[PDB]
Amino acid sequence: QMTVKPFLIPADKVAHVQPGNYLDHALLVLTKTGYSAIPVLDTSYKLHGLISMTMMMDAILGLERIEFERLETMKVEEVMNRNIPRLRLDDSLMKAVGLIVNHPFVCVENDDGYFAGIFTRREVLKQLNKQLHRP
Amino acid sequence: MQMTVKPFLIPADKVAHVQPGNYLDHALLVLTKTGYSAIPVLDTSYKLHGLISMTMMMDAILGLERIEFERLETMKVEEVMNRNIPRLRLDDSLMKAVGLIVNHPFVCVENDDGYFAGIFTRREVLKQLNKQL
């Protein structure tokens, strides 16, 4: 029974944003990263949730218009999703795969309680390919 | 031994899409309703032209002095959609398909007629693998 610790991409290699940053900032980072959502970490590096562009747009959709002016005054904490799956550096690999069937990727918190990195579909699929052999 | 795309396929009618003629603010609106990274761009003939994503839209309007949001109500989807995307066919190997979705959350599939017929996705391959276990 393998565990998460082996496929995990360390936090230092993952972009994130602070819960007090303005949406327009998170928007900028998301545009330049290659992920669907981005972890929201406070100053202590404690994971607070994920935020994606759909989350932002969905919160500024007015009846008459997409109120873009708000991205400059709203902080990420008001839009981010807090109810997210979280894996421990030492959870069953079995458990992790189940979760990435539904989520493009899942956040991994170290044993103390700090964001340690992320478990992705690419890294899992990457291995799978080899156990067969590529195009 | 060598399975094939077909079985995993996700019919096109269960997949949201947009036309090269649509305005970005419209594509923007559609992506916000769907749990997909990007959406296929079909002409009315129903023939794949490329993919559009929120990231592609935001990037085409990132300016020096600001993010020019107003241009989303002006530019058509064809001004930013990636016309250079991988494509499949109902008869391509499953090994070729898996290699492609390692780098792509999902890949477009055109039936032998050259019409969009659905999408090959990571979730569906991972769903299968999760059982195989």
Side-chain angles (χ1 to χ4, degrees), chain A residues 1-4 6-12 14-31 33-71 73-129 131-135, chain B residues 1-130 132-133:
Chain A
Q1 296 299 317
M2 305 164 145
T3 256
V4 190
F7 312 71
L8 176 154
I9 299 181
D12 71 75
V14 187
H16 80 286
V17 293
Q18 296 78 208
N21 300 166
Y22 288 125
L23 301 197
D24 64 327
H25 179 61
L27 197 170
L28 203 171
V29 176
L30 282 175
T31 309
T33 73
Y35 288 112
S36 54
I38 47 178
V40 175
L41 306 174
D42 54 42
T43 50
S44 320
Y45 222 71
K46 287 284 179 56
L47 174 59
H48 285 170
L50 301 170
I51 183 182
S52 54
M53 292 205 267
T54 284
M55 275 178 228
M56 297 184 265
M57 296 309 109
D58 202 30
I60 67 170
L61 284 181
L63 284 168
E64 304 182 53
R65 63 189 180 72
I66 314 178
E67 308 181 303
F68 288 131
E69 69 265 55
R70 296 173 60 181
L71 300 182
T73 66
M74 298 180 77
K75 288 127 177 293
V76 317
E77 66 181 68
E78 292 158 63
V79 181
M80 59 181 221
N81 178 29
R82 298 198 176 79
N83 279 327
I84 51 176
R86 315 197 190 199
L87 287 177
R88 201 193 81 150
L89 279 171
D90 290 292
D91 259 344
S92 52
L93 185 49
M94 229 321 232
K95 175 183 180 178
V97 173
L99 293 169
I100 61 163
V101 177
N102 280 359
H103 314 81
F105 80 85
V106 178
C107 298
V108 192
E109 303 178 307
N110 65 61
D111 298 304
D112 295 329
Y114 292 94
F115 183 70
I118 62 173
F119 187 66
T120 72
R121 282 169 157 174
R122 182 174 193 294
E123 280 306 324
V124 172
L125 287 167
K126 190 170 183 172
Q127 189 69 256
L128 172 64
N129 197 212
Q131 306 178 168
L132 302 184
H133 284 287
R134 16 173 92 185
Chain B
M1 194 47 262
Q2 303 298 312
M3 314 190 0
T4 204
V5 181
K6 270 190 282 221
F8 302 79
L9 180 71
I10 277 188
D13 66 295
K14 304 178 186 174
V15 175
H17 69 75
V18 288
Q19 314 175 179
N22 294 148
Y23 285 91
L24 302 175
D25 65 54
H26 179 55
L28 165 37
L29 205 168
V30 179
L31 276 161
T32 305
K33 302 295 177 180
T34 61
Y36 274 129
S37 62
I39 53 175
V41 173
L42 321 169
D43 50 49
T44 187
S45 321
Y46 224 61
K47 285 174 178 177
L48 191 62
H49 277 302
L51 288 161
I52 183 79
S53 65
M54 201 99 89
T55 286
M56 289 176 210
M57 288 184 254
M58 290 304 101
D59 183 64
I61 68 171
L62 291 183
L64 291 172
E65 293 202 46
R66 67 198 178 73
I67 310 171
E68 315 171 331
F69 287 111
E70 55 284 356
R71 293 166 59 192
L72 299 185
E73 70 194 311
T74 289
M75 296 154 69
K76 297 77 174 74
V77 161
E78 48 176 42
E79 282 167 284
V80 311
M81 60 169 196
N82 176 42
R83 317 189 85 111
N84 188 80
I85 50 172
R87 311 191 181 204
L88 287 174
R89 297 171 283 204
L90 299 164
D91 73 55
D92 279 308
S93 175
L94 171 68
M95 173 177 30
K96 162 190 176 182
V98 180
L100 283 172
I101 49 83
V102 168
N103 279 15
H104 303 276
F106 79 77
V107 187
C108 296
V109 189
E110 302 179 337
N111 62 36
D112 304 301
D113 291 303
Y115 285 127
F116 177 66
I119 62 181
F120 183 72
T121 73
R122 286 180 173 169
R123 172 156 187 282
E124 289 295 299
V125 168
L126 292 156
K127 189 188 307 295
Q128 181 58 50
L129 158 69
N130 179 258
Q132 281 190 184
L133 303 198

mmCIF file of all heavy atoms in Angstrom, chain A residues 12 35 49 52 58 66 74 98 113 131:
data_model
loop_
_atom_site.group_PDB
_atom_site.id
_atom_site.type_symbol
_atom_site.label_atom_id
_atom_site.label_comp_id
_atom_site.label_asym_id
_atom_site.label_seq_id
_atom_site.Cartn_x
_atom_site.Cartn_y
_atom_site.Cartn_z
ATOM 1 N N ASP A 12 6.619 24.574 -2.698
ATOM 2 C CA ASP A 12 7.531 25.569 -3.254
ATOM 3 C C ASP A 12 7.428 25.669 -4.774
ATOM 4 O O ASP A 12 7.820 26.676 -5.362
ATOM 5 C CB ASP A 12 8.974 25.242 -2.851
ATOM 6 C CG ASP A 12 9.521 24.020 -3.566
ATOM 7 O OD1 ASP A 12 9.843 24.128 -4.767
ATOM 8 O OD2 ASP A 12 9.625 22.950 -2.929
ATOM 9 N N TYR A 35 -2.754 25.705 -13.902
ATOM 10 C CA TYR A 35 -3.757 24.965 -13.143
ATOM 11 C C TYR A 35 -5.149 25.593 -13.125
ATOM 12 O O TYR A 35 -5.311 26.805 -13.281
ATOM 13 C CB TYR A 35 -3.271 24.763 -11.706
ATOM 14 C CG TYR A 35 -2.155 23.751 -11.569
ATOM 15 C CD1 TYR A 35 -0.870 24.149 -11.201
ATOM 16 C CD2 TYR A 35 -2.384 22.395 -11.799
ATOM 17 C CE1 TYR A 35 0.160 23.220 -11.065
ATOM 18 C CE2 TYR A 35 -1.361 21.458 -11.664
ATOM 19 C CZ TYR A 35 -0.092 21.878 -11.296
ATOM 20 O OH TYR A 35 0.923 20.960 -11.151
ATOM 21 N N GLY A 49 -8.205 27.239 1.229
ATOM 22 C CA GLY A 49 -9.105 26.836 0.169
ATOM 23 C C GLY A 49 -8.537 27.040 -1.218
ATOM 24 O O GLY A 49 -7.348 27.305 -1.389
ATOM 25 N N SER A 52 -10.699 29.741 -8.308
ATOM 26 C CA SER A 52 -10.535 29.595 -9.744
ATOM 27 C C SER A 52 -11.224 30.775 -10.410
ATOM 28 O O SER A 52 -11.877 31.574 -9.739
ATOM 29 C CB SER A 52 -11.164 28.283 -10.214
ATOM 30 O OG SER A 52 -12.517 28.189 -9.807
ATOM 31 N N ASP A 58 -18.341 34.035 -11.381
ATOM 32 C CA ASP A 58 -19.636 33.663 -10.825
ATOM 33 C C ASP A 58 -20.104 34.603 -9.715
ATOM 34 O O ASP A 58 -21.302 34.723 -9.462
ATOM 35 C CB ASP A 58 -19.568 32.220 -10.312
ATOM 36 C CG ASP A 58 -20.932 31.568 -10.214
ATOM 37 O OD1 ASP A 58 -21.826 31.936 -11.005
ATOM 38 O OD2 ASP A 58 -21.106 30.672 -9.360
ATOM 39 N N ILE A 66 -21.543 41.750 -16.330
ATOM 40 C CA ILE A 66 -20.513 41.090 -15.543
ATOM 41 C C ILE A 66 -19.775 42.268 -14.909
ATOM 42 O O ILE A 66 -18.949 42.910 -15.557
ATOM 43 C CB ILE A 66 -19.528 40.305 -16.440
ATOM 44 C CG1 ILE A 66 -20.299 39.483 -17.478
ATOM 45 C CG2 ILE A 66 -18.676 39.380 -15.586
ATOM 46 C CD1 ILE A 66 -19.410 38.712 -18.440
ATOM 47 N N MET A 74 -12.732 43.393 -4.366
ATOM 48 C CA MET A 74 -13.060 42.179 -3.624
ATOM 49 C C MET A 74 -11.797 41.361 -3.374
ATOM 50 O O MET A 74 -10.944 41.247 -4.253
ATOM 51 C CB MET A 74 -14.061 41.324 -4.406
ATOM 52 C CG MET A 74 -15.405 41.981 -4.671
ATOM 53 S SD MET A 74 -16.499 40.879 -5.589
ATOM 54 C CE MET A 74 -17.029 39.766 -4.288
ATOM 55 N N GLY A 98 -8.992 7.957 -5.761
ATOM 56 C CA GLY A 98 -10.430 8.139 -5.757
ATOM 57 C C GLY A 98 -10.762 9.614 -5.870
ATOM 58 O O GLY A 98 -11.646 10.012 -6.628
ATOM 59 N N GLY A 113 0.159 20.386 9.839
ATOM 60 C CA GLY A 113 -1.077 21.041 9.449
ATOM 61 C C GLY A 113 -0.846 22.133 8.425
ATOM 62 O O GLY A 113 -1.746 22.913 8.119
ATOM 63 N N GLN A 131 3.631 2.471 -17.401
ATOM 64 C CA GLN A 131 3.306 1.102 -17.081
ATOM 65 C C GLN A 131 2.612 0.444 -18.271
ATOM 66 O O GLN A 131 2.191 -0.714 -18.193
ATOM 67 C CB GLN A 131 2.514 1.066 -15.757
ATOM 68 C CG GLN A 131 3.388 1.809 -14.779
ATOM 69 C CD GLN A 131 2.876 2.014 -13.364
ATOM 70 O OE1 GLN A 131 3.657 2.409 -12.498
ATOM 71 N NE2 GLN A 131 1.590 1.774 -13.118
#
